[PDB]
Amino acid sequence: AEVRALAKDIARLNVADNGLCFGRLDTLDDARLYIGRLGIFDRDNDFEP
Amino acid sequence: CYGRSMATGKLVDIGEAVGIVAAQSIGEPGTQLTMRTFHQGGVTGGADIVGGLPRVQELFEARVPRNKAPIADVAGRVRLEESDKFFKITIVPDDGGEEVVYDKLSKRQRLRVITHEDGTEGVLSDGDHVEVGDQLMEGAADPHEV
Amino acid sequence: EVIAEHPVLLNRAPTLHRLGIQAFEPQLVEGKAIQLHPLVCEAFNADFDGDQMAVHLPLSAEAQAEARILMLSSNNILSPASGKPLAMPRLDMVTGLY
Amino acid sequence: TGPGNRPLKSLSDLLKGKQGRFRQNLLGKRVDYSGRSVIVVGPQLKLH
């Protein structure tokens, strides 16, 4: 189970290596939302995307 | 040529069936290796790295690897171009006089990495020097090409 | 009289390597369980929680010589796969020496 | 074919078929002068 989970994570990261970020969205509240192939979150900041 | 016998610690004797010993020694620990999923359905588990018993089966049967990595036919200098999903690598041989091209290398497979002692040269890139039989793409080289 | 110095082959299936069969010198014992040396268990992959073992009797002089020379347990201390010691202290012995 | 819908045997089939010697059985034999019993720890025994 652990080996397969880690292998799946590695393969997903390798696939996402090419063209990580598609674009950006500006919200009417003046926020920013980055759209890409992977979900990257700041584990040190309450997992803010 | 065979040399010291592992069981007796002395030079192998004439007539010893080293072949069966090697077969048993390689096969007995096979149960410790990772294997293909035993679930009947689902997607192919070989898409993710499963390099355990299946890899040994592939090697001993001399079958073409799934993630085949082309090898350099000639030593020289590498010049590299990239596209949306394909690489276009070429080797210019220093002592040779003809460019050797690899034109259909998918980008879903990564390039080779050097990891030099102190230069930290990292991934293969234009201008690097490659010897004969070096792997250009990160993966598994085909035994027949070698 | 007849059992003295007559080797017997002990085997435990499945036999995954040559050290799954080994020659031993018998000793008549009271009871009906086979007394196995603690050190060879790793070779046999045996645990005394109900495991059984088979015994074979070489008859011819050549077979007896082979059992006494090639197959005797004291001559197979090292594993053939890697040469590491196999008949070596385990479990209680390791903790005692430690 | 004659009696019943079975072809007549021939010498070559004695060599081809699983009967005879050439084609193995791949199954273990049962051997005389053999026994089987439960094992217990003989800590006092010598290695041999």
Next chain:
Amino acid sequence: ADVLVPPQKQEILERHEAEADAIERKYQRGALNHTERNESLVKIWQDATEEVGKALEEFYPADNPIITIVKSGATGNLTQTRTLAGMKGLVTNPKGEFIPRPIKSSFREGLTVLEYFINTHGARKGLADTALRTADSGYLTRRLVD
């Protein structure tokens, strides 16, 4: 008396629990997919299990019999010691996936009903897995012998 429980096991867990909460929070806002949320929870709880194991190793005296057996090379692993006196950790679905809810209890403390029920899955799966692995091992061994 000698199956010691590290005093830092209640803090570590709650700390990581907070992180888990945060993940669920981000999942409620739509910043996370279900599978990716489960992956994040699995990573967080793996980190928590590693921390609990380190704390258990630090706490135990050098002369404790339970740790003495493991450290002497006689039997077992620190993983088994953690499962006994630390926390059982993550368990797998019948389909092989990790269950994001860990078994925060330990066999020293005693598992709850649902923890035990979910633990039974992989326990029964291993019985068939071990039998199946021998088939592949024997296949490769017979090829090598031939």
Next chain:
Amino acid sequence: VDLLGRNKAADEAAERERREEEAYAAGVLDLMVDREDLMDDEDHLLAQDLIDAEELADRFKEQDNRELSERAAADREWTYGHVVVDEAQELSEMDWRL
């Protein structure tokens, strides 16, 4: 292709290869220890109880896993989930039929 149809030939060679692989897998299974001869402390699941010869033989085949972009483009009879046509006015009626 549709008007002429396929000759519906017989693939004897591949069938024989599959038969030989299945026979080898069955021999491998027969090579394992049977329930009657088990020496373990207690009865337990054996490989023969869970896997058949055909499954084991298939388990070791190459089982090519080409990508869809490769799998579909090489199959004249592939049915796609969606079709996009730019400059569609240029297609002939037969192209629309296809």
Next chain:
Amino acid sequence: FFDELRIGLATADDIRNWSYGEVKKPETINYRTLKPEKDGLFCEKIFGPTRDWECYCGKYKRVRFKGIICERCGVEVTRAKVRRERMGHIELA
């Protein structure tokens, strides 16, 4: 002991030498008291005693006649079930 094994193509003389007698009668066994026919596929004088120690005419039935030839039958009654290992030949026109 032997070290090599060879197969050649036998000439008619070699086939003749291997044989103990001609199998001329195309019959296996009779019906009354199921006695094999003479010169048949189960003939006594070519292959040997029917099962053990009994010649075709029956006048020789004693285990002591290890090296005796029955005059009328010509059967060389012998131990070791020779008829399972002794073979014949057929001359074809």
Next chain:
Amino acid sequence: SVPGAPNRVSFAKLREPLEVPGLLDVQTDSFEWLVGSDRWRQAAIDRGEENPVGGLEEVLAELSPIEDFSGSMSLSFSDPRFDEVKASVDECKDKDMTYAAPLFVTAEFINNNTGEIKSQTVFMGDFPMMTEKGTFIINGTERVVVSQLVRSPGVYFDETIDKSTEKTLHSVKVIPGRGAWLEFDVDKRDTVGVRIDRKRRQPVTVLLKALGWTNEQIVERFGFSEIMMGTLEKDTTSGTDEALLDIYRKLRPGEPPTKESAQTLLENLFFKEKRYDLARVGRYKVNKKLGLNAGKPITSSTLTEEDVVATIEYLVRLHEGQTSMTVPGGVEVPVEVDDIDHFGNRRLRTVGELIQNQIRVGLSRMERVVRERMTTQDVEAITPQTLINIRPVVAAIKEFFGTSQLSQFMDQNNPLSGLTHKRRLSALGPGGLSRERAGLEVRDVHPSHYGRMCPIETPEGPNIGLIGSLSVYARVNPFGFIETPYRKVENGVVTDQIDYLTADEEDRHVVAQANSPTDENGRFTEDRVMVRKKGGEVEFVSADQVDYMDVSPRQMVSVATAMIPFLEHDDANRALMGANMQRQAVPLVRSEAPLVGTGMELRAAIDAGDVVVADKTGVIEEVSADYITVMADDGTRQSYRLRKFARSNHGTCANQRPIVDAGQRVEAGQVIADGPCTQNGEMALGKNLLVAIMPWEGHNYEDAIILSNRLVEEDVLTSIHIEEHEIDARDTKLGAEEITRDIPNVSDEVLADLDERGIVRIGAEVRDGDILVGKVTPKEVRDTSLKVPHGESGKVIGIRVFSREDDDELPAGVNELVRVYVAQKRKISDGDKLAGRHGNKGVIGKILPVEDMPFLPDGTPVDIILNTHGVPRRMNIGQILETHLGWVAKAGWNIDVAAGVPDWASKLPEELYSAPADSTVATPVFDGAQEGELAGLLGSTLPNRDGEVMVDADGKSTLFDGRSGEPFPYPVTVGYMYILKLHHLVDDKIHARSTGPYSMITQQPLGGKAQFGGQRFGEMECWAMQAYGAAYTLQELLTIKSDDTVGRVKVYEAIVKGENIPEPGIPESFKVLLKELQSLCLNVEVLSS
């Protein structure tokens, strides 16, 4: 609830809202339904079921009427009646008879040509009956019919990955109780096809037209999906007649069609009840899915065109990826795949239903013969008796209880073994599954098993996962689905209302854990609660988001699992091992209830049925070792016969001993005699032994166990084993076999024990080869006496003889039959397997003298020594918990409550504040002695006779070395543990062979201990010998010892004559090959080089 149970203080902190039901109700209720008993009828009519119908009534109503082509003759059946049983259970088991009752049904014949009726009672045969113990007695033996798990009839949708294109494809199949299958699917080319009765695949539109649909109706009902329109437009068939003809051709190839049969074939195939039905459970399932026939009750059991159309629409909607579907006029329902492993789909064929199906087959044969022989008799005189043939029905019943997999010999190893056998759920058997079907997948534990099938119990052998055990609180629906009880919960307060939910019902709600902290009225104290969600996902939810709660923590476990103390401290693997080992503990001469156990031993022992329970209140009148007399207060007198030294199916002793004395007053339901493994009415599968946890000189290395000689001297682990030897005398082509005291060419001393009949006298000691009964046969006679097999011995305790001269019902050809019973006391010996309840098992490696064992400071020697290295790596630390508590139970405790109760004792019920020595305690599996409570109780133990405490607060005691005499340098854990003597004795595992019988099919030594065979020398053993380079030994093994007959005999003679063994060579099987090669004119020659 037991009036006269012994006291056993419990550590349980939760109050049980529901008591454990009758454990073996699954058998008794099912059989009572089958025969339509009065109790079953009263129970069912009170559930809401109107006009209940029994199984026999159901099959007879299905059978009747039986009519000819013209419809002039009719035959009907009604009122199945059962007479008194022919013989008592004891007499049935004595005379090899079947415990059966005559069955009578009234058959009415009607002849429309005259209108005259002729009713007549028809004897339908001797129906085997079920005892109060839930077993069937057949031919003197006791048998159990195990409940069978099967996929219930209905409609099942699935999606699978195409192995060619990797595409996902959807399919559906309609599974009826009987009749043709109907399947629909969407292929890799997005074409909807239908397979009728497993024939060739064809477009679904063909079937739709076959049902009378026109293109307009198809394009109206469908057309929401383009794939259906494509299939319709790409179909080469138009018209109902055209589709019916095509279906006829694809169902009945070659034969000429006709309009007369075009509609009739389909109508008979799928819609007429006499050939197709959903069995009233498929109908319910197909109504619940697809939202069809909602509201009104199930009226007809057959399929309908609406069902087919709804199935097609559901399949297409599922392929399109929709989640909600609404049939025109039906209720909206979800669109989803069906999990075949879910107990919402798997149902249970109980014993009654299996017997009913076999009766149905027999009645079908009877219907065929009746239909045949009405035409061959004068209609003006035919009567119900002449038409009826009861040979087929009795043949069917007799065959089901004989050569059937589900009817199995009762597991009489011990009472718990039989009790678990009765509550067994077998997935295999006729109609269950086959070797070609699911392996790994079907053996998994599914989330829906919770509270219905135990996730731990399963046989160790090839049936792991395929055979399970019913949970304690579970029960079967009339449809056969397993329900389990739950408490209602409202507004966050746990309500006392109990509802039996099926898995399908349970998936729709949220269920909270049993161990929910609640106030006095049931309000949850914690704001958050641990719950099970729909998909079997465990979650933490708000206290007000719960609909149901578990009645008890024992909900998910079965009897044997519930009998494991401190189960939650053991890993699932070792818990399974302990549960299975509890099932194979041999009864001991003296029984002893566990010192520390669960509150399950008493109820399990009473429900197993091996303890004699007083029928009604009374006064004991006369007690003997053979019978007990009770003078009831109602004036009736009861006499209970006790089984003494009776042989179990497995060869164990089934002695029953009274536990009451004359003049005692006994309440109804009180236990008056203990069974094989009970003390005072509760399980006593093992013995409580003083155990020290330590390695000892290596004699307990690798799980070996060291036993004190006391266990041999005091018969602590001694057992009684009884074996049965049978022999028959028959007719022959040359005469008959005769039995007499005379045997030719034998000594006068070998037949000394024989009596006038040539049978060994009772009480005679018999050993290997001793004559039991002498039998002489024609080749001037030949000796064929029965003799004791190799390695067997004992005392002759009983003889049973049956003879044809005395009208005994022996089988054809047999003239006489004799059975001799030999009993032996087996002491505990080296190699015998001992085990605890926590999966700790090992063989006895050494039995030390009493003075060699480590002994306590007062001089008490320990009884057993267990190695330390076994516990920590197996996560079965529960065995340690018990070891501590078992000590606190042996030596009473007294909590000091002077300055208030200690903090650790705040949860203990006041009854646990103190107890005397040799006290018994109860610790349920998931609610019992906590770690802190046990730690304090260890420090609150009473002093011994000398006024000192040996086991300290840590549970350890200073032990003196019995050999050297010096105290061990460190304290050792000492306690009392309950251990079992398992039925894996070395006495019947030692096997040896020098020479013996050979298989005439291959001339190799036979295989088997009872066949005196040889050990297998496998191919891997050949490889191992090859690796050694031991050519001579390998050749000797392969040639002399197995195959070569001439070499075999030659080597035997050489050994017995003291000359060196000769050289094998030129094998016979090589000579045959050489002669075959010569036959092909190949001059094969052996070269000397």
